[PDB]
Write a protein that binds this ligand. Structure first.
Ligand code: HEM
Ligand code: HEM
Ligand SMILES: [Cl-]
Ligand SMILES: [Cl-]
Ligand code: NA
Ligand code: NA
Lengths: 713, 713
């Protein structure tokens, strides 16, 4: 059946904004996963998981009698899709069980691992999500094998459909770089927001870059992709060596024996895939990656044998039974156990990417320290494993259950506890009046609170106004935030804060994070009053202020808005049309298409544009909250043409006289072009809509102010 | 950006079941369009529309000074996408304003018509939908030009995104027949459910079949496509000749002058398309279809001149200025007015498809009768226009406003008024007890009520249990309905009804339509009791019994389920996989994916399958309402293989013993295969879910029972 995407393959796609509707969710409207999980008997789940580790199923027999390596791999891949650039991927939504991840070549035979878990998922039902269970299973694997983990938080609610993520443009699984849809350009520069070297891989190719088995050049790919997953060199070595302390790879015969991935398999496969024609197709004969490597002498027990072997032997190149490049210690005795035959032993083997940890000079220093000090290795690995598997879980306030680690980590963008009474409604009213009396304008107030709150992204639940990090490095100097205007606003607000707090009794004080938000509320209230309407914008106190020392500046860089259509801002010139970047930003802000539409048309007339640009300011009463944007955008009396100077800026002229009325960008004019967006703009641009517009504006404004407020959840 | 549809183009698509979520709807959850419309001042709207008719705008000047022709065309195209095979298309959702219809070649320049109506839409806002306004504007055009309409009903709520409709498989707009994706095969047999001859046409090609200007062969296409749109010969001739009493076509220069359709046009085009480089690009120079025909001597006034000209002249083949085939009157004087120059006149002209009305023998007899009896023509066209524009609106209970015609029409599938007191709760308890005492089984009761209620389709809102049409021709004889079993159930229920009604006082009686549904409720209650649960199923009385003379048997045929996965029924072999047919039926029933899931798993264990098939009856307690379907479908102890005899039937065998446990179809096993469906099935198949399953089952059962209950809405 031919579809709209077939006829108009470049039209903007809005369906990303209406994923995750109540229609696709089996749970009731009022289901609260946190409440369910808080009553789980986590200890009982962990006992069942422990027993599972050594209870082999004949349809996928356990290597060495123990599923722990499989399950660590499973949990690492669940977490390993994460990209810092947009926060997408990661374990936090259990997306490994949906397309396309459930069928990525790097996730081969993890469909077996998930299926092994069904009896436990079934037993506990809605009290443990799949997302939580994949991570918990990896922790219990670790623990069962003698490794002390750093802790565990629950609270990853399940999702019910695929997320829309850009994973690349290649049309062939695993395509080597340099093709028509190459993710590389220049001197091996991977395109943002991608964090893997080939389509369908987690990070790197285990044989080496595009299959070339050079440990030195592989190290460059590891470093780059791990950095794009928020891990530095120490964390990267710890994670790779830690994980390869356990289990084995699977490459017993040629890869051509392996059949269709799950999404392509027949219905009788019942959601499994990669059925293999090689011998028994499983167990001793398993084929997963096509490598055949077993790292340590005790693959079911924590040890420091990975680095003993890596440093203790000299390595030579060889091929697995499927023909993949890997390495063997030919000088070694046969000390590595066989997974099924107690009468066989094997020499040590390593991947090309393992040898990277010894032959890249920076890695070698770290690997040597871990080798000589395996207690340092074990702490670094525990910490990095916790970070890997919680990186996309959001603020610590989301963490559930009895094993949450008490240590506060810099990467968590931590918010100090509030130890004092909060402002009440009367206090908030007094502060709103003081802000408006200071001389700060509607535009200043709205722009500042927007800048503070709109760094939130729901992909990894980082960002938002909590912390008052707008006042700190680097947010204070981001171009989108108008650093000299911002500095003057914050000085005024800080003076108001000092005066209020100095006048109080009995410990009551307001944070600057709360005041920035409250002051934006006052701006919105004043804008409505400018338009002849009395409204109260809701405000919830309880944000706290983080310090510069509690703020990782380099980690915060990926939150910088380089495109913010809601402020008509584009930091430079991108291949991606600006209207596409708008929808992407709306998706990160968790906005539907109606909410995006109302919010943008109101921000335009409140004076939120960077630089005070006139683009899209389709009103003669700027700083009044009206539906002017929509009424004037939709007026057929105005004709629109791209300017000679810039094809992405448009002039709106009176159709009869030629008189210049307005200018606008693609972000502005898409609302008059796109057939779904224009239908929305019509609702808000109708003569009966002034009350609706104001109410819907205030509701979406409040939603944005509260995106990071999981303390109130 | 590579998507799941790219990697797995044949995987089942569930997004169709989650269109139209509250996420995409700008109106609040509680907006009630019927209530808004009821308060509109329709008379004020109609005065505005009358004024618009001759208010010419320079960007699209009115032909002859009057937009009426353009607007009748616009309304005829809004309604003209309708197909009886599935009920999809039609005017009832205002889909003309969204892709792909807004950009179909046959809808060229209707983007201008819709834009002319923005100021009226804007003025009245939410109280008049676009869907209603398109139809209203066509009525006003008719009225304005001297034609008295049969009436008008409001009530078509707006929608906010494209419907998913199969419009064909061609990848080229307007592709002629016999291509790789041909919609024709055999002896010009058009594939169901399609009702147009080429992709992007409303019905037929105005030049003739595949462009061949043969009025006789064109007549064959007209008859077939119009019958696929629920119109017989009399209605077809009345509509074409009525419509072409007005206005003109547009073909002033070569079609190569006309630019991108709306969905492909530049952002500066602000939602319009087909910009033309020919002279002024508009008005006297307009190009729409490429034909240049004006039918009558008074194109802005109702007349009898269409049939005078059709019969009064002999016709010669000629070419328009764009090169299209059309016809000109031999020897005629220049009597037809020019649209813009009062000093020019033109000879009568006709389309190939107009000449069909004279040269097809059956049409000629009707056209002659209308020529000789123009009052008969006027009444037939009025009646047909009402039917055209209301065919997809559903029961008369949905019709709103002061111009609804009182006459009840056979095509409306009419339901007699209720003139008596309804049964109360005590009476319903008494009847349920009589039903369960009769010996009728759970399977009988559930199957009968399912058969009665599941004929509903939300595309055109036909069907459903109101009317008790299951007892009439043709529903009583449909194979899916198990005619012999059904007859024995109905006999028993009709005896219960007669006895109850005979014992009443004061006019109280129960209809058989209500009793059928109440008896199904009793079956579900009994099934719950069988499973050890205390459940009460909701029941709302007030259905009435329609007569055979109120039930057009030929129109009812299109409602026959030839595939009903809910009963594991497939009438024959289709190209389309059975699971795809299931999702299609769930969409017609207005179900989401969770609702489809719960409903099918419950129906299986209640004994709803046609023929008492054991396919998918994964329980050892048939006729008990449990979640056995899900728990047993998801048991990894069972292995599934297609049978040697039929690849679409599967055996489930104990994996260790080889013993046969179950059989299933594709409909059954898709719930264990498709990654989104299996996630749903896992919720219902978990140890904590028996209560949720029962409660969600009873809710979706009741939803299905009430689909046509617009008397309660
Ligand atoms: C440069 C990064 C990495 C590469 C290229 C890599 C590559 C692979 C490959 C090719 C296998 C074999 C899959 C199979 O054939 O069964 C695998 C196995 C495994 N990997 Fe990694 N890996 C990386 C990092 C990780 C990390 C960060 C962890 C966890 C902290 C991890 C843990 C595991 C485990 C436990 C297995 C064994 C699976 C089993 O016993 O069934 N790896 N790795
Ligand atoms: C065999 C079925 C039909 C065919 C092939 C047909 C074809 C066409 C075409 C080619 C045009 C010219 C479009 C343009 O260039 O602007 C048109 C115009 C029009 N048609 Fe039809 N038509 C059909 C049925 C109908 C019906 C059922 C109605 C209404 C009851 C209708 C009402 C009109 C009107 C009023 C116009 C004039 C538009 C104007 O003045 O701008 N037609 N038709
Ligand atoms: Cl994601
Ligand atoms: Cl439709
Ligand atoms: Na994420
Ligand atoms: Na329809």
């Amino acid at each position: 059946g031919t579809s709209n995407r077939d006829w108009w393959p470049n039209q903007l796609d809005l369906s990303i904004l209406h994923r995750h509707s109540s229609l696709s969710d089996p749970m009731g409207k009022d289901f609260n996963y946190a409440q369910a999980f808080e009553k789980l008997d986590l200890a009982a789940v962990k006992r069942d998981l422990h027993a599972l580790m050594t209870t082999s199923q004949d349809w996928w027999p356990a290597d060495f009698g123990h599923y722990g390596g499989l399950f660590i791999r499973m949990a690492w891949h669940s977490a390993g899709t994460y990209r810092t650039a947009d926060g997408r991927g990661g374990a936090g939504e259990g997306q490994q069980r949906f397309a396309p991840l459930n069928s990525w070549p790097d996730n081969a035979n993890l469909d077996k691992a998930r299926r092994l878990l069904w009896p436990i998922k079934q037993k506990y039902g809605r009290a443990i999500s799949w997302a939580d269970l994949l991570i918990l299973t990896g922790n219990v694997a670790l623990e069962s094998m003698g490794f002390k983990t750093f802790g565990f938080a629950g609270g990853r609610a399940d999702t019910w459909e695929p997320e829309d993520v850009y994973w690349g443009s290649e049309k062939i699984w695993l395509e080597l770089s340099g093709g028509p849809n190459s993710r590389y350009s220049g001197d091996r520069q991977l395109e943002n927001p991608l964090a893997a070297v080939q389509m369908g891989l987690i990070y790197v190719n285990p044989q080496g870059p595009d299959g070339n088995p050079d440990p030195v050049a592989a190290a460059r790919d590891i470093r780059d992709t791990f950095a794009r997953m928020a891990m530095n060199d120490e964390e990267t070595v710890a994670l790779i060596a830690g994980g390869h302390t356990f289990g084995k790879t699977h490459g017993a015969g040629p890869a051509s024996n392996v059949g269709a991935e799950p999404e392509a398999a027949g219905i009788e496969a019942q959601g499994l895939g990669w059925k293999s024609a090689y011998r028994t197709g499983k167990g001793a004969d398993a084929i997963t990656s096509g490598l055949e490597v077993t790292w340590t002498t005790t693959p079911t027990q924590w040890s420091h044998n990975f680095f003993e072997n890596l440093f203790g032997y000299e390595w030579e190149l060889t091929k697995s039974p499927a023909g993949a490049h890997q390495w063997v210690a030919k000088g070694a005795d046969a000390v590595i156990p066989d997974a099924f035959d107690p009468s066989k032993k094997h020499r040590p083997t390593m991947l090309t990417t393992d040898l990277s940890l010894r032959f890249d000079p920076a890695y070698e220093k770290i690997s040597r320290r871990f080798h000589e000090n395996p207690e340092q290795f074990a702490d670094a690995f525990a910490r990095a494993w916790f970070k890997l598997t919680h990186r996309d879980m959001g603020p610590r306030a989301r963490y559930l259950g009895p094993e949450v680690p008490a240590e506060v980590l810099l990467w968590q963008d931590p918010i100090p506890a509030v130890d004092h009474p909060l402002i009440d409604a009367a206090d908030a009213a007094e502060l709103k009046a003081k802000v408006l009396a200071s001389g700060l304008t509607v535009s200043q107030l709205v722009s500042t609170a927007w800048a503070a709150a709109s760094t939130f992204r729901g992909s990894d639940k980082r960002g938002g106004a909590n912390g008052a990090r707008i006042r700190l490095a680097p947010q204070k100097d981001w171009e989108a935030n108008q650093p000299e205007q911002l500095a003057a606003v914050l000085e005024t607000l800080e003076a108001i804060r000092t005066a209020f707090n100095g006048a109080q009794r009995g410990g009551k004080q307001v944070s600057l994070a709360d005041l920035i938000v409250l002051a934006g509320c006052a701006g919105v209230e004043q804008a409505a009053k400018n338009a002849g309407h009395a409204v109260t914008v809701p405000f919830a106190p309880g944000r706290a202020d983080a310090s510069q020392e509690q703020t990782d500046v380099e980690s915060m860089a990926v939150l910088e808005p380089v495109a913010d259509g809601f402020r008509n801002y584009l930091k430079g010139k991108y291949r991606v049309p600006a209207e596409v970047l708008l929808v992407d930003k709306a998706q990160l802000l968790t906005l539907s298409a109606p909410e995006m539409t109302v919010l943008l048309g109101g921000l335009r007339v409140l004076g939120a544009n960077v630089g005070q640009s006139r683009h899209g300011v389709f009103t003669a009463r700027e700083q009044a909250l009206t539906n002017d944007f929509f009424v004037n955008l939709l007026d057929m009396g105005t004709e629109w043409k791209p300017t000679a100077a810039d094809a992405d800026v448009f002039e709106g002229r009176d159709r009869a006289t030629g008189e210049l009325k307005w200018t606008g960008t693609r972000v502005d004019l898409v609302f008059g072009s796109h057939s779904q967006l224009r239908a929305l703009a019509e609702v808000y641009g109708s003569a009966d809509a002034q009350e609706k517009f104001v109410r819907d504006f205030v509701a979406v404004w409040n939603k944005v102010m509260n995106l990071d407020r999981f303390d109130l959840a």
